[PDB]
Amino acid sequence: APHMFSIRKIITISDYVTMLNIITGLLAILLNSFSLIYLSIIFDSLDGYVARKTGTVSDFGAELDSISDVVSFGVAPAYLLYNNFESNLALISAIIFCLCGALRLARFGILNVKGFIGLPIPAGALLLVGFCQLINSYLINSILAILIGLLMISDIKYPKYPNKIFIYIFAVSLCLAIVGIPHFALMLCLIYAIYGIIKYIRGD
Amino acid sequence: MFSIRKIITISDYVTMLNIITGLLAILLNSFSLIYLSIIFDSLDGYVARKTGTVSDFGAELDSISDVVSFGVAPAYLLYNNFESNLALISAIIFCLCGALRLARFGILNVKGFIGLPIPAGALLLVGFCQLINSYLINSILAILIGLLMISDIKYPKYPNKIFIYIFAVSLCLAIVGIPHFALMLCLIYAIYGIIKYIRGD
Numbered sequence: 340a341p342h343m344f345s346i347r348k349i350i351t352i353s354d355y356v357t358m359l360n361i362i363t364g365l366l367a368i369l370l371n372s373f374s375l376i377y378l379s380i381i382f383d384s385l386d387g388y389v390a391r392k393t394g395t396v397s398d399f400g401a402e403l404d405s406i407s408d409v410v411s412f413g414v415a416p417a418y419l420l421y422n423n424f425e426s427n428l429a430l431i432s433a434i435i436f437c438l439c440g441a442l443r444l445a446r447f448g449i450l451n452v453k454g455f456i457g458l459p460i461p462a463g464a465l466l467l468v469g470f471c472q473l474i475n476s477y478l479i480n481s482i483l484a485i486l487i488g489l490l491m492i493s494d495i496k497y498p499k500y501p502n503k504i505f506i507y508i509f510a511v512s513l514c515l516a517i518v519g520i521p522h523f524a525l526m527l528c529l530i531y532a533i534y535g536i537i538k539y540i541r542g543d
Numbered sequence: 544m545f546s547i548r549k550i551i552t553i554s555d556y557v558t559m560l561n562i563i564t565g566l567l568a569i570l571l572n573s574f575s576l577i578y579l580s581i582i583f584d585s586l587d588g589y590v591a592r593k594t595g596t597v598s599d600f601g602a603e604l605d606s607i608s609d610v611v612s613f614g615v616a617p618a619y620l621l622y623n624n625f626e627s628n629l630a631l632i633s634a635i636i637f638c639l640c641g642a643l644r645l646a647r648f649g650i651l652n653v654k655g656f657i658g659l660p661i662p663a664g665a666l667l668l669v670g671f672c673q674l675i676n677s678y679l680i681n682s683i684l685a686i687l688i689g690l691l692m693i694s695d696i697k698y699p700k701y702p703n704k705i706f707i708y709i710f711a712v713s714l715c716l717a718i719v720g721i722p723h724f725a726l727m728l729c730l731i732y733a734i735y736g737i738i739k740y741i742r743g744d
């Protein structure tokens with residue numbers, strides 16, 4: 340309503356990181372690049388940190404963070420699975436995956452302080468793109484796409500903030516994943532995901 | 544294990560069909576599924592209010608579905624079918640602008656639209672892409688739509704029964720390969736919005 344482009348008046352320096360995230364997420368689809376999903380995970384960790392450090396946390400930025408997660412962690416991995424493993428089964432699996440990412444983002448939007456309920460969408464997306472790069476099988480990667488989707492919409496608790504050590508080596512491994520070597524990021528992400536399930540089943 | 548199923552409404556299932564068609568617009572490279580998404584996007588909130596199943600989860604899933612169907616998929620459909628540096632940058636701006644207005648809309652609760660609504664933007668881009676064989680012109684329009692989408696131009700939220708009667712038919716005509724009337728109806732809506740803003744009335 341105010342003249343033409345009043346939306347610049349609510350954009351912060353954090354939103355610019357978020358937009359970088361949206362670009363890398365969209366380019367993951369447009370260029371068929373797993374490499375850019377790993378960059379998206381780095382940016383998705385960076386935009387909330389910049390918000391808190393620079394003191395520019397905003398509701399608009401919180402919403403754009405989620406919207407960015409849809410592109411890069413919900414649409415893009417499902418696109419990358421189908422485009423690189425074209426089959427009826429990977430079509431249905433990419434659909435489940437994206438839908439499961441969408442529902443946990445919808446559930447995250449309503450309640451989000453406790454931690455992570457279910458596998459967080461950046462971690463799900465890393466698992467899928469990791470499996471897609473290291474396993475040359477549409478059936479298996481189609482199967483895992485559903486298993487990740489089901490974890491994402493689970494009640495399985497996952498901690499929100501890794502320790503300094505884990506951030507440190509996970510940060511390195513995501514960049515190593517950016518340059519073609521995803522094993523350490525995929526391995527680190529499995530341990531996180533599998534440990535969550537074990538705790539749930541064990542009841543601890 | 545799966546307490547989420549206690550939250551799902553029957554309108555959420557509509558929203559999920561919307562996400563599916565909007566995702567399949569990307570995966571199958573289908574302009575015609577963008578038009579079905581617009582129909583589903585108008586159906587899920589209607590079914591929500593009609594069935595008494597309005598929820599906050601569903602309000603969010605509705606926006607999340609617009610990201611896929613109307614932000615990501617049209618930018619994809621522009622770059623995939625007009626591969627070029629110019630279309631790449633325009634796809635990026637289109638999507639960014641769709642994301643920014645969805646973010647603004649997410650923190651808003653107003654009677655009309657502020658800026659061009661993202662389903663209307665997605666329609667113009669997809670229509671132009673089908674009826675204009677020119678990456679440059681389509682690349683230009685993508686940016687012009689993005690700017691409209693994040694603008695302060697006021698657009699009405701619910702059309703009159705006559706307009707939705709004709710628009711609905713024209714969306715299905717668009718689905719079977721004839722987008723002219725949907726695109727033409729969407730242009731009247733957008734350009735009339737611009738004129739009223741410029742006129743100031």
Ligand SMILES: CCCCCCCC/C=C\CCCCCCCC(=O)OC[C@H](COP(O)(O)(OC[C@H](N)C(=O)O)OP(=O)(O)OC[C@H]1O[C@@H](n2ccc(N)nc2=O)[C@H](O)[C@@H]1O)OC(=O)CCCCCCC/C=C\CCCCCCCC
Nearest residue numbers: 554555558584585587588591597598601602605606711732
């Ligand atoms: C093809 C066959 C298939 C079917 C058959 C066909 C049947 C036919 C019938 C219907 C078909 C549709 C008819 C056309 C209407 C399309 C509307 C549209 O074009 O697309 C609409 C979005 C959707 O609307 P919106 O999306 O903003 O959602 C807000 C936001 N997304 C959020 O969710 O927060 O609002 P919603 O009603 O969906 O629900 C809002 C709330 O519902 C709750 N909620 C929601 C979900 C949930 N699971 N649970 C919840 O509880 C929840 O509370 C939510 O907040 O908007 C628009 O009008 C875009 C405007 C585009 C207008 C441009 C076209 C111009 C047309 C005419 C111009 C006139 C020209 C002059 C004419 C003269 C010459 C002739």
Ligand SMILES: CCCCCCCC/C=C/CCCCCCCC(=O)OC[C@H](O)CO
Nearest residue numbers: 548549551552553554555556557559560563
């Ligand atoms: C993506 C799937 C799309 C599916 C179709 C979308 C349109 C909704 C149709 C309703 C028909 C009547 C159903 C009403 C009675 C069934 C109750 C119900 O749907 O509940 C589900 C429950 O939450 C278990 O998860």
Ligand SMILES: CCCCCCCC/C=C/CCCCCCCC(=O)OC[C@H](O)CO
Nearest residue numbers: 557582586587589590591592593594595596
């Ligand atoms: C693709 C097929 C054709 C496309 C067109 C799709 C039409 C969908 C209509 C839904 C209305 C459902 C009727 C709702 C009946 C009442 C259910 C209910 O429980 O309503 C509670 C409410 O509070 C009481 O006013």
Ligand SMILES: CCCCCCCC/C=C/CCCCCCCC(=O)OC[C@H](O)CO
Nearest residue numbers: 356358359362363366627628629631632635
């Ligand atoms: C602070 C960190 C910021 C880092 C930077 C992020 C900026 C946003 C990303 C833009 C990618 C642009 C992708 C499009 C690539 C343009 C170059 C190109 O297309 O090349 C033209 C040449 O003519 C071909 O032969």
Ligand SMILES: CCCCCCCC/C=C\CCCCCCCC(=O)OC[C@H](O)CO
Nearest residue numbers: 352356385386388389390391392393394395
């Ligand atoms: C690739 C590596 C990227 C690394 C990214 C670096 C992010 C930190 C940069 C600036 C923070 C400080 C900026 C100063 C702006 C104002 C800060 C402020 O006032 O915040 C205090 C807040 O209230 C708390 O209590």
Ligand SMILES: CCCCCCCC/C=C\CCCCCCCC(=O)OC[C@H](O)CO
Nearest residue numbers: 425426427428430560563564567571576579
């Ligand atoms: C309510 C209206 C319905 C909405 C529901 C969504 C609409 C799109 C659904 C299907 C399009 C075609 C789906 C893709 C079919 C693939 C064709 C096939 O057989 O797959 C090839 C296979 O690899 C061997 O060649």
Ligand SMILES: CCCCCCCC/C=C\CCCCCCCC(=O)OC[C@H](O)CO
Nearest residue numbers: 431434435438439492545547548551559563
């Ligand atoms: C013809 C081409 C189109 C083919 C389309 C194939 C995919 C549709 C199949 C299932 C969707 C599942 C919906 C998303 C996952 C379930 C959502 C949900 O509500 O989960 C409830 C609970 O977690 C469990 O009971």
Ligand SMILES: CCCCCCCC/C=C\CCCCCCCC(=O)OC[C@H](O)CO
Nearest residue numbers: 370371372373374375378511514515517518
């Ligand atoms: C050794 C660890 C150090 C590495 C730290 C890196 C930090 C992030 C910097 C740049 C990432 C941007 C790279 C963008 C890559 C473009 C990918 C692409 O365009 O597509 C791939 C193509 O399909 C295949 O040929």
Ligand SMILES: CCCCCCCC/C=C\CCCCCCCC(=O)OC[C@H](O)CO
Nearest residue numbers: 552553554556557560586590593594595596
């Ligand atoms: C290929 C898949 C096609 C799927 C179908 C076509 C597209 C969906 C359109 C309309 C669904 C109408 C929804 C049916 C609403 C029934 C009313 C109702 O039963 O609502 C009770 C409510 O749950 C209170 O408890």
Ligand SMILES: CCCCCCCC/C=C\CCCCCCCC(=O)OC[C@H](O)CO
Nearest residue numbers: 359362363366370375378626627628629631
């Ligand atoms: C912090 C770093 C953040 C960086 C974020 C973005 C990373 C780079 C992404 C894409 C590379 C550009 C890909 C450009 C591909 C087309 C350019 C080109 O050469 O075009 C070929 C021909 O001229 C016409 O088809």
Ligand SMILES: CCCCCCCC/C=C\CCCCCCCC(=O)OC[C@H](O)CO
Nearest residue numbers: 567571572573574575576579715716718719
């Ligand atoms: C005159 C209008 C009468 C009513 C109109 C009917 C409404 C259509 C409803 C569902 C069809 C779903 C559309 C199927 C499109 C999926 C196929 C696909 O995506 O293929 C890509 C490309 O178009 C391959 O040629």
Ligand SMILES: [Ca+2]
Nearest residue numbers: 383384387404
């Ligand atoms: Ca974030």
Ligand SMILES: [Ca+2]
Nearest residue numbers: 584585588605
């Ligand atoms: Ca809607």
Ligand SMILES: [Cl-]
Nearest residue numbers: 344345346694
């Ligand atoms: Cl504005």
Ligand SMILES: [Cl-]
Nearest residue numbers: 447454455456
């Ligand atoms: Cl959560």
Ligand SMILES: [Cl-]
Nearest residue numbers: 447459460461
């Ligand atoms: Cl998440």
